[PDB]
Amino acid sequence: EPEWTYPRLSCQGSTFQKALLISPHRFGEARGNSAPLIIREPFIACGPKECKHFALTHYAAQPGGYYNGTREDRNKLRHLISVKLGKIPTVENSIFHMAAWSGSACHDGREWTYIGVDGPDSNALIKIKYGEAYTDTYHSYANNILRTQESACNCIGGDCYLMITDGSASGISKCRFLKIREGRIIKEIFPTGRVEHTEECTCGFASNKTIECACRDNSYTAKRPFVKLNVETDTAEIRLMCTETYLDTPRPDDGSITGPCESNGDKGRGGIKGGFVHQRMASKIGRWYSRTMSKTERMGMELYVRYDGDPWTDSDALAHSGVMVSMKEPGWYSFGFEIKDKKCDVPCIGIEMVHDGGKKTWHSAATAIYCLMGSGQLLWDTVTGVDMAL
Amino acid sequence: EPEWTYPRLSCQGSTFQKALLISPHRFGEARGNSAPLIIREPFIACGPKECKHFALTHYAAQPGGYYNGTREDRNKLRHLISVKLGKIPTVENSIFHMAAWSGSACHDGREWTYIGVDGPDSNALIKIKYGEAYTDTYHSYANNILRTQESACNCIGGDCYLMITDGSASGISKCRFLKIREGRIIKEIFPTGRVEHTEECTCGFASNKTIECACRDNSYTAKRPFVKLNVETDTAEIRLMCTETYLDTPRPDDGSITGPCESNGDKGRGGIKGGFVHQRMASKIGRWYSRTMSKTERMGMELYVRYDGDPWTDSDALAHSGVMVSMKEPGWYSFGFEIKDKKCDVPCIGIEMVHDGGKKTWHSAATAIYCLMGSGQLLWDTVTGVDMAL
Amino acid sequence: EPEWTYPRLSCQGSTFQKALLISPHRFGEARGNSAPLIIREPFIACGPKECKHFALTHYAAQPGGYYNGTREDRNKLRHLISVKLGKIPTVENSIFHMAAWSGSACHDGREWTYIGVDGPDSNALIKIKYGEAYTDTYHSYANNILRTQESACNCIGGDCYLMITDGSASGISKCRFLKIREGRIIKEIFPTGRVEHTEECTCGFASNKTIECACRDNSYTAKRPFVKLNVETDTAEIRLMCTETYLDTPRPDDGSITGPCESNGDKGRGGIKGGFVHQRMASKIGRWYSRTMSKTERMGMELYVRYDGDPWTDSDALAHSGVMVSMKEPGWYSFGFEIKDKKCDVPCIGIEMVHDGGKKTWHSAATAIYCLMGSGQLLWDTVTGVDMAL
Amino acid sequence: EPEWTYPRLSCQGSTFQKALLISPHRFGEARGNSAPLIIREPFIACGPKECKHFALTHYAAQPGGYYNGTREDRNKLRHLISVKLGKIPTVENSIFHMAAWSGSACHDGREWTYIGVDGPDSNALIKIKYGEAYTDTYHSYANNILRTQESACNCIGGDCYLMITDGSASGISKCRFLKIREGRIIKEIFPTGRVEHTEECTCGFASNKTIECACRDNSYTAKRPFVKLNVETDTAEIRLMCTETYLDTPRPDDGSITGPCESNGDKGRGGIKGGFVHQRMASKIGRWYSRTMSKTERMGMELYVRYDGDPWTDSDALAHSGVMVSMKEPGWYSFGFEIKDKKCDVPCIGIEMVHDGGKKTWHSAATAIYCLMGSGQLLWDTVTGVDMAL
Ligand SMILES: *[C@@H]1O[C@H](CO)[C@@H](O)[C@H](O)[C@H]1NC(C)=O
Ligand SMILES: *[C@@H]1O[C@H](CO)[C@@H](O)[C@H](O)[C@H]1NC(C)=O
Numbered sequence A, B, C, D: 001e002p003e004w005t006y007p008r009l010s011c012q013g014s015t016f017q018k019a020l021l022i023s024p025h026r027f028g029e030a031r032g033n034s035a036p037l038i039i040r041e042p043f044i045a046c047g048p049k050e051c052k053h054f055a056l057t058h059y060a061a062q063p064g065g066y067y068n069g070t071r072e073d074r075n076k077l078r079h080l081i082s083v084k085l086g087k088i089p090t091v092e093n094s095i096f097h098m099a100a101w102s103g104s105a106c107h108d109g110r111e112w113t114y115i116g117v118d119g120p121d122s123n124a125l126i127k128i129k130y131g132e133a134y135t136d137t138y139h140s141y142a143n144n145i146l147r148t149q150e151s152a153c154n155c156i157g158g159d160c161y162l163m164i165t166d167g168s169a170s171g172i173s174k175c176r177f178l179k180i181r182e183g184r185i186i187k188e189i190f191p192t193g194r195v196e197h198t199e200e201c202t203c204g205f206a207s208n209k210t211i212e213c214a215c216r217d218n219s220y221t222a223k224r225p226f227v228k229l230n231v232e233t234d235t236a237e238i239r240l241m242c243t244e245t246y247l248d249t250p251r252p253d254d255g256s257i258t259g260p261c262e263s264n265g266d267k268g269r270g271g272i273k274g275g276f277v278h279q280r281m282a283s284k285i286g287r288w289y290s291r292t293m294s295k296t297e298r299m300g301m302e303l304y305v306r307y308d309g310d311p312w313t314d315s316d317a318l319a320h321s322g323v324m325v326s327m328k329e330p331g332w333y334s335f336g337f338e339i340k341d342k343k344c345d346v347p348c349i350g351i352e353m354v355h356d357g358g359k360k361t362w363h364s365a366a367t368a369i370y371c372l373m374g375s376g377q378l379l380w381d382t383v384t385g386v387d388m389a390l
């Protein structure tokens, strides 16, 4: 059969560069003839030959008549959809995989696993699909919006790992990791460490033994919870990132949080899912991260790297590597993913750029992608080009 | 070349969950830009790698100008169409297979068999297509609307079995089974037993030896005719379901039909096609059924199960397993189908949710799917989200 | 490589039955959201696994703004297009093969040959395409609208035969047959016999040694020129069909043409391309033909068969086998084609049903298909269901 | 795995004929229902089985609201898109490959290499994609609009060659060639000879040893820079075409530039990308060229040929071979490409036909194709048929 996927060394390169904008609403004018779906929480996951661009649709198109409610997050109509990366996600181009108001997906080398959560807030359900077949579920353990990554899960040797979490958005949300093989949960992993609130983890492989994730604390800190999951022992520990370049939004000024690495700090309440991807070299590991340019709003997006060290203990600033989205443009969730080239993996970050005109009109998103490419420095930014009044 | 398909044991699970909603008219607004087809009698059938979503279209789209007559069942324009399950059935996504105002289709492991009936009421015709080729036909034997299942036919080892019936909707309709191999009828099966009215059979494999069907008696009873068809001797016998949980609509109160299992009881006139699917375990058989929440109108839909026993002799109430569609939402025809996972089969029930605003506007349907998935209880219901005035 | 196609015995059956309507303009309402192409001269040709539905488009859609000129036949914008049979031929579904105002195509078992004619009236050009590649041309020999079949060419052992003709529409048009192998003309065949006007031949295989064609005489007779082409010697002879059931339109009453078989008769001027397909049995040959129900207008379409005999000498009436299109509906060009089933060939006739509101509005066509299917008699007719004012 | 592609001998033929018109804006009427993309700089490139039709879109459709700015060349929204040749480039049919305001692409027998340039004018960037993976980049060396061919690159044995140039449009632009293997630049080639301005090279194989290109000098001359690139030593030399039939636009009268082949002459300022393709015979090489009918405006397009000789030293007029587009119709960029028949290659020229109504309306283009086909003379011209007011 195809053989199972493993992380490989990254393809050679030393800077990210603007790769692709998928801006569906450039075609949603009332006088045009297209039907872009109203979506949010996009992410991309790739298998050996193709990438799919996933998103959670409110099951409505622009132009159209169901804009009411599209700023909400959870309802009975939200579905996980995909298009091949490079296609515009329209009513006809999209595949509707399952009813879901939170999702993830990943390819294990042989088939796609799709993950979606739906159900009532106090009783939600993780649903897993392997190809066409619905294969397994996992129940709410804290009865308060069980939810998952909004980005790719990660498979190695056929075993796929997924972050899930449950609990109060302004309180405790202890995450768990599920180990999934061919659509079935074969193991629950309970992390150790600083565990009081971890959600929306962006995970990737640091090597064949470790998955690392930069996550969101929506309650206590502007530092990101950082998971190190050991794949050989199936154990996870979590501690806060110690860098002075806080990656959450909102956040205080860099370096202003005093005290040891684990200090929570100020402006911890609220948050945003953040980009994180690995560049695996033979002797050195690059960790690439994105954060909004505004400290308090979802506006702009800048790139940072750091090679080696230990995220849990290094307080050093990350090196700024370029403006992907200017302050003038929306920069909402971001996520990492890898494209498989013939012999190496290409790290990328994608950026959700939400068109927000509030609760009175449609609410949806463009997706911008930056990937490691060549050398020198990052050269250009992304605008969505959308005028919401059309 | 590909192996012939056989029924396998079902995948492990003990409850159904909400899987997917295909709701094409969420895109039919007169200010939108899409073309969902006007359809009724949807059903799904899967082969080893893919499922197709079939329906009978009135060869008209919403928005459009051909709404008049779309509530009627039989005319010269209806066609059997399909899209791959997960795509929205629009003008451009659909394949028009054949002219048909009643249909069925199944995959046998190597190719699709499509069945459609058309012709005048008094002298209609079963036409069979195998892949691209029209291959055989079967004539009306009672000259009163020859018609078939409106759901998947069933193949084992290259032989596909199909219910057909012919006769008065208010009187006698004796059904027959056809055994089809590579598109050509190789056998006609004349059932024994209680045969005065059987139509719209939903059938599946209880084992490699027996096909069972839960059917509609439109004249005499609210108990469903239940068929046991022995695939080895090609013989079939029919008797009424004895359970006090009557599955047809309209129906009397549960348990009010006194007398032996064969008493017809009251409010037998009228009916609805009902969902039915098997969960085949090594030692036991679960039979899952659906019926409307309302006793008299096509509103709501609830799930029921029974393990083992004999449907012909057990008067026991069936075990309620969850509300799939509430009473505020339409619940019209339902059907069972099975998805092929790698090593086991997944049972699902599909539900036609008709948007009915009477004869003065368009008339068409959404399809909701629930599949056996994990354990626990069924968690969420389905709404179409469609406003017919848009 | 795939092996070359040969004609096989026909699949068993004894009557034609309504198979499929492709009516694109059921979706062309000004208030709808679709783009059916404006087309005419449809035909279908099949290879081993699929059929394509071809047509000559005026390169315009309904609704739209280029209806002027769509009743003309020849201009600089007409193109040969195809969709997979069963799809609606819309702007997005269609493939544009080449610029052409007359066409043909056929599959030889390994690849598609496409044929289109364009160029000035007095100097037109046959262009041949094998797959994606343009491989050959043939020049006008009589300088007066070189043109070809408007239906499938026919391949045997890799050699594909095509009728072409050139000359006055109200005078002499001597046809030629080209023998084409992998897109290149390897032989010209000059027929013998009654040769003064032959155009729009509908050809098929009577066996592995003979191609027969029922053609159109636009100038001198309402009888059809009937070609017998010997594939082993690459020679052709033509004589008029002698049956009293004249197949052209316009035509005089049946049997009213006196004198020997080759007598031209009355009302010979004008004509229509006609359906003709073979049913090859081991000991008997059925020839199936269609003609309009009106003797003078393109309205209605009826089926006729005759088994064996010799079309050149038998004066016997053909046996009427059913009304495919009532007098009330358009019946314009018709054509034959065969669908390949696993072990036998299925004969069909398709009917162009043109929506004609004259020169002041759009002009386009639905395609109706009838195929040999089962036994008994033909049961239902086809309406397009199109209201041209919408 | 698939063999690497090499240039073969051309298929037999001696004249070009009209092959195909892709005219997407025949469907762009505000009362229609389609979404053709607004595009400029189309080109076509073929691999062994399929050709793709590429263009640079402004990420806007007709009808729509983003027409302003669609006449400008470089901005943050332009993307390289493709559709399979023969499909209309709409919103739903196109694949968005990468952000790019200048592009090229070629197939090497195993995979597609896509090249796009974006970034600010003073510091732009060549980005290369091989299949789905972003693989390499090349920096600006003269900091004045680094840019590439706007037509197919050329691969032999897995090595693909690409012209790039950087420099002032009014002065010096020294071009370079990149040698790319599986998406990564393995060699930079610095030409010799007359190198002061070479841009928009149309290149193809004269043999397995030489790539030749006919290019644009936008500052000094109306004679085209003509490149001979020796693929074995990876060296290139450039000299002006000596023919009195000057191929650029604007141009002086044919033969009015006196002096040696290298004299620049008059009306050198300005230019246009020109068509050029090879017909490789066993003993002789035909070089086919296109140029506008107008000497000063981008109207019309005519074909010219010359067999053998040396383009650098032959002052001979080229042989006129037919009017592909009359003077009433737009003739803007043109390019050559080759289709792969089974055993030989077919040369074609494509012509961009821009609908230009100035900066106050949409600006986009149709693509017309002429291919070597049979013998005789070129018979018909091409019109777009588009009314910009619709
Ligand atoms: C991971 O393991 C596989 C072998 O199991 C190996 O091919 C691959 O290179 C390893 N990945 C990395 C980054 O070391
Ligand atoms: C049915 O038979 C096939 C082989 O004939 C077997 O592999 C399959 O497991 C059997 N199914 C059941 C339900 O026993």
Ligand SMILES: *[C@@H]1O[C@H](CO)[C@@H](O)[C@H](O)[C@H]1NC(C)=O
Pocket (backbone or CB within 6 Å): C006, C007, C008, C009, C207, C208, C280
């Ligand atoms: C035609 O010839 C081939 C063998 O070359 C044979 O297989 C086929 O049956 C023949 N067709 C008919 C109708 O005899």
Ligand SMILES: *[C@@H]1O[C@H](CO)[C@@H](O)[C@H](O)[C@H]1NC(C)=O
Pocket (backbone or CB within 6 Å): D006, D007, D008, D009, D207, D208, D280
């Ligand atoms: C080029 O080389 C290939 C093999 O390397 C050969 O098959 C082909 O015919 C050659 N082409 C030309 C134009 O000589």
Ligand SMILES: [Ca+2]
Pocket (backbone or CB within 6 Å): A216, A217, A218, A219, A220, A221, A222, A223, A248, A249, A250, A267, A268, A269, A270, A271, A272
């Ligand atoms: Ca926070």
Ligand SMILES: [Ca+2]
Pocket (backbone or CB within 6 Å): A092, B092, C092, D092
């Ligand atoms: Ca479409």
Ligand SMILES: [Ca+2]
Pocket (backbone or CB within 6 Å): B216, B217, B218, B219, B220, B221, B222, B223, B248, B249, B250, B267, B268, B269, B270, B271, B272
């Ligand atoms: Ca009943």
Ligand SMILES: [Ca+2]
Pocket (backbone or CB within 6 Å): C216, C217, C218, C219, C220, C221, C222, C223, C248, C249, C250, C267, C268, C269, C270, C271, C272
């Ligand atoms: Ca005539």
Ligand SMILES: [Ca+2]
Pocket (backbone or CB within 6 Å): D216, D217, D218, D219, D220, D221, D222, D223, D248, D249, D250, D267, D268, D269, D270, D271, D272
């Ligand atoms: Ca110039």
